[PDB]
Design a protein around this nucleic acid. Structure first.
Lengths: 120, 67, 66
DNA sequence: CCGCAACCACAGAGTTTGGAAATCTT
DNA sequence: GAAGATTTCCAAACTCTGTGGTTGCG
């Protein structure tokens, strides 16, 4: 789905919802794109950071590069981000040498994810 | 327990839910085969007109090329 | 009796068979989906090939003229 | 007080998995 | 008919959202 520039000018990645429910599947498929040239089969990993949580547990945080893209299957966020705080994840392309990219204040992980205001 | 009133009811609804799903998947599968024919028809159709535009442009080029 | 040696063997035998067969089912299911994408690929590729030649003929027509 | 944003639990619809029977096909 | 294959039935184990009870904190 629509993509966005990263901290790095060599890689683009999928846009993410502002806030989503921990351990729930995302609206789109998370994918990383390399503008330069990168060897298919290049392992790519995603970590999620935050002041509060140093690194939050994730599911399907690894993916093999293919045709300049490393599509991720049902990537998932286990750890939470803390009220009002967002996760700043770290994409890490495993080439020679390993390359790094960052998407700042990317997604928010709460136990409920977006909910409908309570009718009280 | 296996004779609870809750039991049977919960159980009997799950059953309905299952019928639903089985039906659903069985259906998607079919729609897929359909989706495959659909395209096979298109590749055949595409393939025919492709061998056409190749003969027609290879013919026009023939009068031209050899004069 | 749903618990008489004979039945029991016959039962297990069938199970052995439903397992094998469910398996085949899924496999065939995947092949299809695969086949699908594999077409869509070829289908898209052919559409170009047409475009390519359609233009190419519009050129040897506008060319025969001039 | 109230409503928002987070947590926790925890119903209830969906799904996937697997052994029985029925139904088929050979 | 007989044997194996396929399908239909369900039960059980989980997975996928939702909603309700609470709570600090504007």
């Amino acid at each position: 789905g629509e993509l966005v520039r990263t901290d790095s000018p060599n890689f683009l990645c999928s846009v993410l919802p502002t806030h989503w429910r921990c351990n729930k599947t995302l609206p789109i498929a998370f994918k990383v794109v390399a503008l330069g040239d990168v060897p298919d089969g290049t392992l790519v990993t995603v970590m999620a950071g935050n002041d509060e949580n140093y690194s939050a547990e994730l599911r399907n945080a690894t993916a093999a590069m293919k045709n300049q893209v490393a599509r991720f299957n049902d990537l998932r966020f286990v750890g939470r981000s803390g009220r009002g705080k967002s996760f700043t994840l770290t994409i890490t392309v495993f080439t020679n040498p390993p390359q790094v990219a960052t998407y700042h204040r990317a997604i928010k992980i709460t136990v409920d994810g977006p909910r409908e205001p309570r009718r009280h | 327990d296996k004779h609870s009133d809750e039991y049977k009811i919960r159980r009997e609804r799950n059953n309905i839910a299952v019928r639903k799903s089985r039906d659903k998947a069985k259906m998607r599968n079919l729609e897929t085969q359909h989706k495959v024919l659909e395209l096979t028809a298109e590749n055949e159709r595409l393939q025919k007109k492709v061998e056409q535009l190749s003969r027609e442009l290879s013919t026009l080029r023939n009068l031209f090329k050899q004069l």
